[PDB]
Design an enzyme around this catalytic site. Structure first.
Site, mmCIF file in Angstrom:
data_model
loop_
_atom_site.group_PDB
_atom_site.id
_atom_site.type_symbol
_atom_site.label_atom_id
_atom_site.label_comp_id
_atom_site.label_asym_id
_atom_site.label_seq_id
_atom_site.Cartn_x
_atom_site.Cartn_y
_atom_site.Cartn_z
ATOM 1 N N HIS A 1 47.948 -3.660 -5.268
ATOM 2 C CA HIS A 1 47.516 -4.643 -4.295
ATOM 3 C C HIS A 1 46.037 -4.537 -3.916
ATOM 4 C CE1 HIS A 1 49.097 -7.254 -0.798
ATOM 5 N NE2 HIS A 1 47.789 -7.177 -0.606
ATOM 6 N N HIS B 1 42.393 -7.226 -4.157
ATOM 7 C CA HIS B 1 41.790 -8.538 -4.444
ATOM 8 C C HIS B 1 40.415 -8.420 -5.082
ATOM 9 C CE1 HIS B 1 44.557 -10.923 -1.735
ATOM 10 N NE2 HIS B 1 44.908 -9.660 -1.546
ATOM 11 N N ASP C 1 38.042 -10.780 -5.414
ATOM 12 C CA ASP C 1 37.015 -11.391 -4.577
ATOM 13 C C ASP C 1 36.809 -10.641 -3.267
ATOM 14 O OD1 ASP C 1 39.453 -12.250 -3.503
ATOM 15 O OD2 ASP C 1 38.901 -14.370 -3.417
ATOM 16 N N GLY D 1 46.565 -15.436 1.643
ATOM 17 C CA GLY D 1 45.853 -16.199 2.646
ATOM 18 C C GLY D 1 46.386 -15.980 4.046
ATOM 19 N N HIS E 1 52.724 -11.971 -0.035
ATOM 20 C CA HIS E 1 52.275 -11.275 1.164
ATOM 21 C C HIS E 1 53.251 -11.740 2.222
ATOM 22 C CE1 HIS E 1 48.493 -11.139 -1.030
ATOM 23 N NE2 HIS E 1 47.823 -10.575 -0.039
ATOM 24 N N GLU F 1 53.033 -8.937 6.981
ATOM 25 C CA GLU F 1 51.745 -8.312 7.234
ATOM 26 C C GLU F 1 51.502 -8.535 8.714
ATOM 27 O OE1 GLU F 1 48.302 -9.961 5.137
ATOM 28 O OE2 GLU F 1 47.074 -8.299 5.870
ATOM 29 N N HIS G 1 52.536 -5.787 1.766
ATOM 30 C CA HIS G 1 52.521 -5.289 3.141
ATOM 31 C C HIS G 1 53.952 -5.027 3.598
ATOM 32 C CE1 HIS G 1 48.206 -5.850 3.655
ATOM 33 N NE2 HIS G 1 48.322 -7.087 3.200
ATOM 34 N N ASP H 1 43.557 -3.122 -0.861
ATOM 35 C CA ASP H 1 43.555 -4.518 -0.445
ATOM 36 C C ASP H 1 42.188 -5.195 -0.566
ATOM 37 O OD1 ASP H 1 44.798 -6.832 0.397
ATOM 38 O OD2 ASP H 1 44.924 -6.230 2.494
ATOM 39 N N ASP H 2 41.257 -4.877 0.332
ATOM 40 C CA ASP H 2 39.923 -5.491 0.287
ATOM 41 C C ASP H 2 38.855 -4.440 0.624
ATOM 42 O OD1 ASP H 2 40.467 -8.684 0.180
ATOM 43 O OD2 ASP H 2 41.950 -7.804 1.533
HETATM 44 O O1 LIG Z 1 42.246 -13.026 -3.411
HETATM 45 C C1 LIG Z 1 42.453 -14.390 -3.008
HETATM 46 C C2 LIG Z 1 42.445 -14.539 -1.471
HETATM 47 O O2 LIG Z 1 43.470 -13.805 -0.918
HETATM 48 C C3 LIG Z 1 43.206 -13.754 0.459
HETATM 49 N N1 LIG Z 1 43.431 -12.409 0.970
HETATM 50 C C4 LIG Z 1 42.668 -11.319 0.731
HETATM 51 N N2 LIG Z 1 43.187 -10.283 1.393
HETATM 52 C C5 LIG Z 1 44.287 -10.713 2.062
HETATM 53 C C6 LIG Z 1 44.446 -12.028 1.803
HETATM 54 N N3 LIG Z 1 45.509 -12.727 2.370
HETATM 55 C C7 LIG Z 1 46.381 -12.113 3.172
HETATM 56 N N4 LIG Z 1 46.272 -10.819 3.459
HETATM 57 C C8 LIG Z 1 45.232 -10.054 2.924
HETATM 58 O O3 LIG Z 1 45.855 -8.776 2.176
HETATM 59 C C9 LIG Z 1 41.708 -14.149 0.584
HETATM 60 O O4 LIG Z 1 41.580 -15.449 1.182
HETATM 61 C C10 LIG Z 1 41.035 -14.153 -0.823
HETATM 62 O O5 LIG Z 1 40.114 -15.244 -0.909
HETATM 63 ZN ZN LIG Z 2 46.125 -8.806 0.129
#
Ligand SMILES: OC[C@H]1O[C@@H](n2c[nH+]c3c2N=CN[C@H]3O)[C@H](O)[C@@H]1O
Ligand SMILES: [Zn+2]
Length: 349
Positions: free
Chosen positions: A12, A14, A16, A181, A211, A214, A235, A292-293
């Site tokens: 998990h 992303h 971007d 999202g 997702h 969360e 999550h 995650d990010d």
């Molecule tokens: O990776 C695609 C998209 O997933 C969404 N994203 C990223 N992290 C998360 C998320 N959406 C929900 N939770 C988080 O874990 C963002 O809008 C990013 O542009």
């Molecule tokens: Zn995510």
């Protein structure tokens, strides 16, 4: 010292949301596109966050930099290549990177993301671009990398196209479909475009992850399991609020993609309460540790490992256990999944 200096599996993360601040500054300057900071350091601090917000508040961080990557072929392939180099350095041997192809396109997408001017980079082209960068990173760094295409909660009209993309590039890095999202959009899991995309995935065998739980209620998780037919839950912290559903999914060996540090900053996890992952550990549930990010959370995979170790009481044993679990729940074919498990057992001796 890293909390767990042995091979890891990540399910998990992303693409971007895992871009170098330096690479963002490069393209912003090259394309003459406004950035909220002019140095990589200032850029890190404004794009990043070190205190809890909300899911919608965190999602707003993408507006800052996406314009600089989106619609730029060179950039798309570059961040995919660099992601692999980032992960290899983290001791990751297999990773599945997720992203929305539409949010990076500037042709044949409606509505036009980030107010871009019409171009020729289609959602399809971005998938092919990411495939190339990920393959070259795999070759150059010696780790196995796959991708997951994301449906966006607020844009269900893109979902059937995401499904077709997953079909078209099956195993060409693309191993599954996700729903991402804003989970706060009430009933977003049930929009028809999303539902139809997933049902067609079941009938066509395309892997599924969603997702849920969360920041949403256990009912969002139930919707993911019952209607969308997910094989894994991104999550899923809130599942534990409904004992029956939790004990059902636990009894069903459902995989939970846990992102510790992430849950803290999005507010998904109330720091006043014991983290759900502790219960997951105590019940010996099927779960994984994920970043995650990392760009926005100014973190790395070790961040999540230290967090669960220093606080929460995780041991080396559990770390190996959850990673063998993540390998088993990967959307990798049996032959390749077998090879991954051979690797972990070999290097965990
Ligand atoms: O990776 C695609 C998209 O997933 C969404 N994203 C990223 N992290 C998360 C998320 N959406 C929900 N939770 C988080 O874990 C963002 O809008 C990013 O542009
Ligand atoms: Zn995510």
């Amino acid at each position: 010292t890293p909390a767990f200096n042995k091979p890891k599996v990540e399910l998990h993360v992303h693409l971007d949301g895992a871009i170098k601040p330096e690479t963002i500054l490069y393209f912003g300057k090259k394309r003459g596109i406004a950035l909220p900071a002019d140095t990589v350091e200032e850029l890190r601090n404004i794009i990043g966050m070190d205190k809890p917000l909300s899911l919608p508040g965190f999602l707003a961080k993408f507006d800052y930099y996406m314009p600089v990557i989106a619609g730029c072929r060179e950039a798309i392939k570059r961040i995919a290549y660099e992601f692999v180099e980032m992960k290899a350095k983290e001791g990751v041997v297999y990773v599945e990177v997720r992203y929305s192809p539409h949010l990076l396109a500037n042709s044949k997408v409606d509505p036009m993301p980030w107010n871009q001017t019409e171009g020729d980079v289609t959602p399809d082209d971005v998938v092919d671009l990411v495939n190339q960068g990920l393959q070259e990173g795999e070759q150059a760094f010696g780790i196995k990398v796959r991708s997951i295409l994301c449906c966006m909660r607020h844009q269900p009209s893109w979902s059937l196209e995401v499904l077709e993309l997953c079909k078209k590039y099956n195993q060409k890095t693309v191993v599954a479909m996700d729903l991402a999202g804003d989970e706060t959009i009430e009933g977003s899991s049930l929009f028809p475009g999303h539902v139809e995309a997933y049902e067609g995935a079941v009938k066509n065998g395309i892997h599924r992850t969603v997702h849920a739980g969360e920041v949403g209620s256990p009912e969002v998780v139930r919707e993911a399991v019952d209607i969308l037919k997910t094989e894994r839950v991104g999550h899923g912290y809130h599942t534990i609020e409904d004992e029956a559903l939790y004990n059902r999914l636990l009894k069903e060996n459902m995989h939970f993609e846990v992102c510790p540090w992430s849950s803290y900053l999005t507010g998904a996890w109330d720091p006043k309460t014991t983290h759900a992952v502790v219960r997951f550990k105590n019940d010996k549930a099927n779960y994984s540790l994920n970043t995650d990010d990392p760009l926005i959370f100014k973190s790395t995979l070790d961040t999540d490992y230290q967090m669960t170790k220093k606080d929460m009481g995780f041991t080396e044993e559990e770390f190996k256990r959850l990673n063998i679990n993540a390998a088993k729940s990967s959307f990798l074919p049996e032959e390749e999944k077998k090879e991954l498990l051979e690797r972990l057992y070999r290097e965990y001796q």
